[PDB]
UniProtKB/Swiss-Prot annotation:
This is Sodium channel protein type 5 subunit alpha. IV repeats lie at residues 858-1126. The keyword Signal does not apply. It catalyses: Na(+)(in) = Na(+)(out). It comes from Rattus norvegicus. The chain holds residues 121 to 1780 of 2019 of the full protein. The gene is Scn5a. Belongs to the sodium channel (TC 1.A.1.10) family. Nav1.5/SCN5A subfamily.
Length: 1126
């Protein structure tokens, strides 16, 4: 039997039955509300498992042998789940927690598979390599959280109410804090949205109207999970701004409490926190992964007829024509839209039949004329014939979905689309089994939530979904829980974590959402990166001499730089309040006139200097000429008529003025040279994404076109009734007796391949799919009003799309950028781009500053008692003792909140005095270390300066007490304390390498972000002239706008992080009533509170693509310096 035990164990069929058993148990777990019948079934499963529990142990047939077998980690899962089932069969008390653990039986899928255990053993390796990075990011987030703790102590909590605190209640009258927190029906709701509008003391925060007073005292943050006080909450908020998830909303709320200035903080953070930390995580994961992969019916009749048709075969000569016919098929299907003319659609079906007959006849002749057995052989022609069969099925909704599948043969004449095909192959091939891990992991968490939250999801529903109904993302089902796990895999958690916490409870909801975020994102990361790696007279001459001496000299250069900077500032003063001061209005008029004159002058000078050949040889000189010609047209239209009708068309192009800056600056021009190097590598990938999105957009047209339109009667703004009030756009007309009802399509939808491309961008950017998916699935019929969830499985479209549309397209994109950039490092005269000659020098000097072989250790004082001082000092003990002292200081610095209690205030002040006393003592002992500690190590000058500064703090506090009290400066006075903790960089060597690498790569990053600043400038003035007077919508508030240049710069800043651009686009794209009405009374001549959809999409899409290219360049600079460190 023991012999029989083994000879059944190694038997393969036994393990395959095990695997199928596991999967069936899985499907029988996934159910919610399990019928009681099914209940008996689970008994059986236990038996099955337990029976092997026999075989496994019985293959050992011995005590020590069976314990050696259990000694394996994977079989521990079997032992545990089987004994759990046994004890549950024995006795129940049962709080239903025991019903959840049955999910881990899924992990047995890992150790039954020959590679799953291998892959998951591979994963834990990269996370252990991620050790130093994890330490740096937690310390960095703690530092920034202390910054934000002292900066925004309860600062978020400010709200606007009606006026209170009137007179002699003594405080209990409104018409103390009790009724004030009871007030929220008094809170000033952010118009058109569900939000209490913040405010602040500063003359920058969100300002309330008449009838409202602004006071910090508020009930709570948005749901208590945002706030910056209570350092744990600040750690959460800075976690999200490290992940940038919904970071725009916290950005808005902060800058509507505190004031716009503090945005510096955010960009600092978003330059350090999100950007840099995430990029390092990327770098280390990729490095460890590449390492791991490196470690790895008559005779003459038959003859004559075969040879006649062979003579036919002698000239196919239709392949390019057939390819054009395929492209014409795709086009013919593409000229499809919402309201198609009758005879139009008749012709379209006509051509449908045309193309079908064409390809069907072609295949019918080819398969018979070349070889039936060969067309049995080559699978390519086989799949062509498959699509033939599918066309036949259509001819003799979804019936169209296959007609597209031919475009892919282009991949043989088009190599990079073959590369996309190889990529999606590796998504199932080389690393494809890795993807199974993802599956399983999703499958685990996909259910681990519902049984923990779904029941709760099912009952406090009024807490999580305001519109009384199921929420848009619940977990009660298993589809919806797959969608939550998916969205979280898409880096968008906290906006559903607030839900999960507001239903059930903080502890477990955290433990599961942080778990899914970290775990699943690490897996998605390893997959992403595995893909990226598997993708691998004489007076004439005299005057000319004067001219060279003029223009080549530093004085003219610096003067022209001063001119161009003043012209850029001129542009910057094109705000909407020019009318507010008349003087500046003619001031800038004369300014512009001087600019035109000096620039045409220097144009002439360059002309005679180089002559037209060397002049128009330069592209930058070409650009300068184009701009100056625009200015010439402008000035002549000013002087000699011909204006005010239609160069008011060429009027705004003046905003491109700063485009002259790139030529003369040493840092912009070089990275711009780099980007023109990326156009030959981005055009092809743009075209690949163009085709590979045209497919999906056609598909969404077939399934979707027209169905999106629903919107509303002008009463509310939210989609109409499915019960109904209206089902039909031809049934709302019977109610349009009053125009209050509007049947409008959603601002971005599938009515073309154009708006299809737009909705596909908004989806695969993840910022603004909400209305897309919602009004996509909810829709049922071609013009049937969307029933609240019907056709619900159409999420499967986006999901499928999203995978490609993000994890391959973007993937492939990044791919070609690397090699190109990689190849750019080869033939370039240098090894790393983005560094000027002087910047190369500076980087080499900064690196030589990284000397690890030290100098002479220390001069002994020879003073006996100073010898004892030395004997206690230069040892490692005193250092780590001081280190624990500074860490206890750290925790002293974490505990504080706002308005804690006066006793706590005094206690913490006294503890600060205690610690600074400690540090003065250490400072005097250090200045007397031997003699020279004040200059032997910069790590000691740091301690000296922080001691003196700490002393300055206490004295400053005393001065504030005795002579005067300031308001926010007081806060800075109490602020520099964080510097103390920074010594850890002295202790920490890993962080001392990482932030050092950041310093190393700060030059190239300065250049790239400088170009970024210039582009923000161009676009911000571009909008200030173009995007003015737009209506307020959800993304475009009162403060983040385009009215001035500051607000424009703040908006375009957030959009520099590809965030919010949905919410800023939606107020632009809109056209016509109700929201947009007779254009506007504008102080400017340009009328309209409305946006221009053409140029709106142009502006925002182009900013996204450009800024995204600059940002990828930033990322690659970071990573290349990272590798050059090691
Ligand atoms: C790309 C992968 C997409 C996978 C989506 C699978 C959806 C399966 C599904 O909806 O069945 C759901 C259950 O699926 C399973 O039980 C596990 C299937 C594996 C039923 O959900 P319902 O709303 O209660 O009806
Ligand atoms: C790994 C993470 C382990 C998570 C265990 C945290 C325990 C959660 C319990 C908890 O509620 O902590 C509360 C604070 O928790 C939070 O606010 C969020 C904490 C987020 C930590 C994020 C860690 C990221 C890991 C990297 C206690 O603070 P409170 O202000 O007194 O709130 C009381 C009632 N609102
Ligand atoms: C690994 C082990 C980590 C253990 C984490 C269990 C911690 C559960 C904390 C807890 O209290 O769960 C409470 C309910 O406990 C449960 O639901 C049982 C959950 C069993 C854990 C399932 C194991 C998951 C395995 C993956 C809910 O928290 P709360 O008391 O409502 O907090 C409200 C405070 N405002
Ligand atoms: C090395 C190159 C340094 C580049 C220096 C200046 C680039 C020209 C940027 C235009 C200055 C904007 C002036 C302006 O907006 O005035 C209107 C005032 O704007 C403000 O108050 C915000 C200040 C924005 C500073 C942007 C740098
Ligand atoms: C490269 C991408 C630049 C995209 C700008 C070209 C379309 C400009 C907006 C436009 O012409 O649509 C005008 C009216 O707007 C529409 O309804 C058509 C929507 C077409 C949006 C095409 C967006 C392309 C997105 C590129 C994805 C890569 C015509
Ligand atoms: C080690 C000693 C920790 C001393 C903690 C004393 C408890 C102070 C109250 C407290 O935990 O503050 C709460 C937050 O305090 C903390 O965050 C301490 C967390 C220590 C993180 C170090 C783990 C690595 C909120 O108030
Ligand atoms: C090195 C630097 C490289 C620079 C490269 C290209 C520079 C691009 C220059 C075009 C940018 C400006 C285009 C533009 O604004 O035309 C706007 C186009 O107007 C439209 O309706 C767009 C029609 C959609 C056609 C799609 C393609 C747009 C054509 C431009 C390219 C007109 O603006 P506006 O409505 O007159 O605003 C006046 C309010 N005061
Ligand atoms: C911006 O900060 C100012 C502080 O200058 C806030 O005004 C002050 O608000 C407090 C209440 O929160 C007032 O205190 C009250 O006055 C009596 C006077 O005897 C005081 O004894 C009590 O403590 C009582 O709470 C304080 O008088 C008031 N200052 C003035 C001159 O009205 C202001 O509310 C802040 N703005 C916002 C947006 O809340
Ligand atoms: C309140 O009104 C304004 C006050 C100044 C403020 C906060 C405003 C917007 C632009 C802001 C600037 C964008 C610039 O962009 C940067 C970033 C990159 C730098 C290299 C160049 O300038 C900021 C320093 C510059 C800036 C962040 C500094 C602060 C500016 C609002
Ligand atoms: C602005 O005002 C709009 C309003 C309503 C207009 O009705 C629409 C009817 C269909 C029409 C003419 C328009 C939009 C998409 C259009 C398509 C975008 C496709 O994409 C292309 C271009 C990109 C290529 C990669 C693929 O094919 C076009 C050939 C394809 C197209 C231009 C063909 C014609 C389509 C207008 C009036
Ligand atoms: C290799 C080099 C690139 C090249 C010429 C190859 C053949 C197909 C080519 C494509 C056909 C597509 O046809 C188009 C035209 C219609 C567009 C809507 C998208 O697809 C080109 C962009 C697309 C294309 C012209 C771009 C370039 C491709 C050979
Ligand atoms: C019923 C109503 C249609 C519906 C919701 C259901 C099943 C298939 C679903 C489709 C698979 C199609 O194919 C998809 C997914 C599979 C991909 C191969 C191609 O595109 C979806 C666009 C298409 C789909 C996801 C859209 C919605 C379809 C249920
Ligand atoms: C348009 O909406 C109307 C009202 O919802 C529907 O028109 C029909 O509704 C009546 C009432 O039940 C039925 O008797 C007819 O049979 C319906 N028409 C058809 C063609 O079945 C219907 O929902 C929509 N009809 C059209 C043509 O769009
Ligand atoms: C019902 O009909 C009225 C009259 O057309 C609609 O009101 C106008 O809708 C158009 C749509 O572009 C706008 O251009 C006009 O500005 C609207 N007029 C107003 C009120 O100023 C109304 O929208 C229609 N409602 C339905 C049934 O969709
Ligand atoms: C909010 O909207 C109302 C609607 O008329 C408007 O009057 C008010 O100025 C707006 N205020 C803010 C802060 O958006
Ligand atoms: C509210 O009323 C008080 C007292 O009249 C006034 O000082 C304050 O400016 C008002 N604020 C509002 C309603 O904007």
């Amino acid at each position: 039997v023991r012999r029989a035990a083994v000879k059944i164990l190694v038997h393969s069929l036994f393990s395959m039955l095990i695997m199928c058993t596991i999967l069936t148990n899985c499907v029988f777990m996934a159910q919610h509300d399990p019928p009681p019948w099914t209940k008996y079934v689970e008994y059986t499963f236990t038996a099955i498992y337990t029976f092997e529990s026999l075989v496994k142990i019985l293959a050992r047939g011995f005590c020590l042998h069976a314990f050696t077998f259990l000694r394996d980690p994977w079989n521990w899962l079997d032992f545990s789940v089987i004994v759990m089932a046994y004890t549950t069969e024995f006795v129940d008390g049962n709080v239903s927690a025991l019903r959840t653990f049955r999910v881990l039986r899924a992990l047995k899928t890992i150790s039954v598979i020959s590679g799953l255990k291998t892959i998951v053993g591979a994963l834990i390796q990269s996370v252990k390599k991620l050790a130093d990075v994890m330490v740096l990011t937690v310390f960095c987030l703690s530092v920034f959280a202390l910054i934000g703790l002292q900066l925004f102590m309860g600062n978020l909590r400010h709200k606007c109410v009606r006026n209170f605190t009137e007179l002699n209640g003594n405080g209990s009258v409104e018409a103390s804090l009790d009724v004030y927190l009871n007030d929220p029906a008094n809170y000033l709701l952010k118009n058109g949205t569900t939000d209490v509008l913040l405010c602040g003391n500063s003359s920058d925060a969100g300002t309330c109207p008449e009838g409202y007073r602004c006071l910090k005292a508020g009930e709570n943050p948005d749901h208590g999970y945002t706030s910056f006080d209570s350092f744990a909450w600040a750690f959460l908020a800075l976690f999200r701004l490290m992940t940038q998830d919904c970071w725009e909303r916290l950005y808005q709320q902060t800058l509507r409490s505190a004031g716009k200035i503090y945005m510096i903080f955010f960009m600092l953070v978003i330059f350090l926190g999100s950007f840099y930390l995430v990029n390092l995580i990327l770098a280390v994961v990729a490095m460890a992964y590449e390492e791991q992969n490196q470690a790895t019916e008559c005779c003459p009749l038959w003859m004559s007829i075969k040879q006649k048709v062979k003579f036919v075969v002698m000239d196919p000569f239709a392949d390019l024509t057939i390819t054009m016919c395929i492209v014409l098929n795709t086009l013919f299907m593409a000229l499809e839209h919402y309201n198609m003319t009758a005879e139009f659609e008749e012709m379209l079906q006509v051509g449908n039949l045309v193309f079908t007959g064409i390809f069907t006849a072609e295949m019918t002749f080819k398969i018979i004329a070349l070889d039936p057995y060969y067309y049995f052989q080559q699978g390519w022609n086989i799949f062509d014939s498959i699509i033939v069969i599918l066309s036949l099925m259509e001819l003799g909704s979804v019936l169209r979905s296959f007609r597209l599948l031919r475009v892919f043969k282009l991949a043989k004449s088009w190599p990079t689309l073959n590369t996309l095909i190889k990529i999606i192959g590796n998504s199932v091939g080389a690393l494809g089994n890795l993807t199974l891990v993802l599956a399983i992991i999703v499958f685990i968490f996909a259910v681990v939530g519902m049984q923990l939250f779904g029941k709760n999801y099912s009952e406090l529903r009024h807490r999580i979904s305001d519109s009384g109904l199921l929420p848009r993302w619940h977990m009660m089902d298993f589809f919806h829980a797959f969608l939550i796990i998916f969205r979280i895999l898409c880096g968008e958690w906290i906006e559903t974590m607030w839900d999960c916490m507001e239903v059930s409870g903080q502890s477990l909801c955290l433990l599961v959402f942080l778990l899914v975020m970290v775990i699943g994102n690490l897996v998605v990361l390893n997959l992403f990166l595995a893909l990226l790696l598997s993708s691998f007279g004489k007076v004439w001459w005299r005057l000319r001499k004067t001219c060279y001496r003029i223009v080549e000299h530093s004085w003219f250069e610096t003067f022209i730089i001063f001119m161009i900077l003043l012209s850029s500032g001129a542009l910057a003063f094109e705000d909407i309040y020019l009318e507010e001061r008349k003087t500046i209005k003619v001031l800038l008029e004369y300014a512009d006139k001087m600019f035109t004159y000096v620039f045409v002058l220097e144009m002439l000078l360059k002309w005679v200097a180089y002559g037209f050949k060397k002049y128009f040889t330069n592209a930058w000189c070409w650009l300068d000429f184009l701009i100056v010609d625009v200015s010439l047209v402008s000035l002549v239209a000013n002087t000699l008529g011909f204006a005010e009708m239609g160069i008011k068309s060429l009027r705004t192009l003046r905003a491109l003025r700063p485009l002259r800056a790139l030529s003369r600056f040493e840092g912009m021009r070089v990275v711009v040279n780099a980007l023109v190097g990326a156009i030959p590598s981005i055009m092809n990938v743009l075209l690949v994404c163009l085709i590979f999105w045209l497919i999906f957009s056609i598909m969404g047209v077939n399934l979707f076109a027209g169905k999106f339109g629903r919107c509303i009667n002008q009463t509310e703004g939210d989609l109409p009734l499915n019960y109904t009030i209206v089902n039909n756009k031809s049934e709302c007309e019977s109610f349009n007796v009053t125009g209050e009802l509007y049947w409008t399509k959603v601002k971005v939808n599938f009515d073309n391949v154009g708006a299809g491309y737009l909705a596909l961008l908004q989806v695969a950017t993840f910022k603004g799919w909400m209305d897309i998916m919602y009004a996509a699935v909810d829709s049922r019929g071609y013009e049937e009003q969307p029933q609240w969830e019907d056709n619900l499985y159409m999420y499967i479209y986006f999901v499928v799309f999203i995978i490609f549309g993000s994890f391959f397209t973007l993937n492939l994109f990044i791919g070609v950028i690397i090699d190109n950039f990689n190849q750019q490092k080869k033939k370039l005269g240098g090894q790393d781009i983005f560094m000027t000659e002087e910047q190369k020098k500076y980087y080499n000097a900064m690196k030589k500053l990284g000397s690890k072989k030290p100098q002479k250790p220390i001069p002994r004082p020879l003073n006996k008692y100073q010898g004892f001082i030395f004997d206690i000092v230069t040892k490692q003990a005193f250092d780590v003792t001081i280190m624990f002292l500074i860490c206890l200081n750290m925790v002293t610095m974490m505990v504080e909140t706002d308005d804690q209690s006066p006793e706590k205030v005094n206690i913490l002040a006294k503890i600060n005095l205690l610690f600074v006393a400690i540090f003065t003592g250490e400072c005097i002992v250090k200045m007397a270390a031997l003699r020279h500690y004040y200059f032997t190590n910069s790590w000691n000058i740091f301690d000296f300066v922080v001691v003196i500064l700490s002393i300055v703090g206490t004295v400053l506090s005393d001065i504030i007490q005795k002579y005067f009290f300031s308001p926010t400066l007081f806060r800075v006075i109490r602020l520099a304390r964080i510097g103390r903790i920074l010594r850890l960089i002295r202790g920490a060597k890993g962080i001392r390498t990482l932030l050092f690498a950041l310093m190393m790569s700060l030059p190239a990053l300065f250049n790239i972000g400088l170009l970024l600043f210039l582009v923000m400038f161009i676009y911000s003035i571009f909008g200030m002239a173009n995007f003015a007077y737009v209506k307020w919508e959800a993304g475009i508030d009162d403060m983040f706008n385009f009215q001035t240049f500051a607000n424009s710069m703040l908006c375009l800043f957030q959009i520099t992080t590809s965030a919010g651009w949905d919410g800023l686009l939606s107020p632009i794209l809109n056209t016509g009533p109700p929201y947009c009405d007779p254009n506007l009374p504008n102080s400017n001549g340009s009328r309209g509170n409305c946006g221009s959809p053409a140029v709106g999409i142009l502006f925002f899409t182009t900013y996204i693509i450009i800024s995204f290219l600059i940002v990828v360049n930033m990322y690659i600079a970071i990573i290349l310096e990272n590798f050059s460190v090691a």
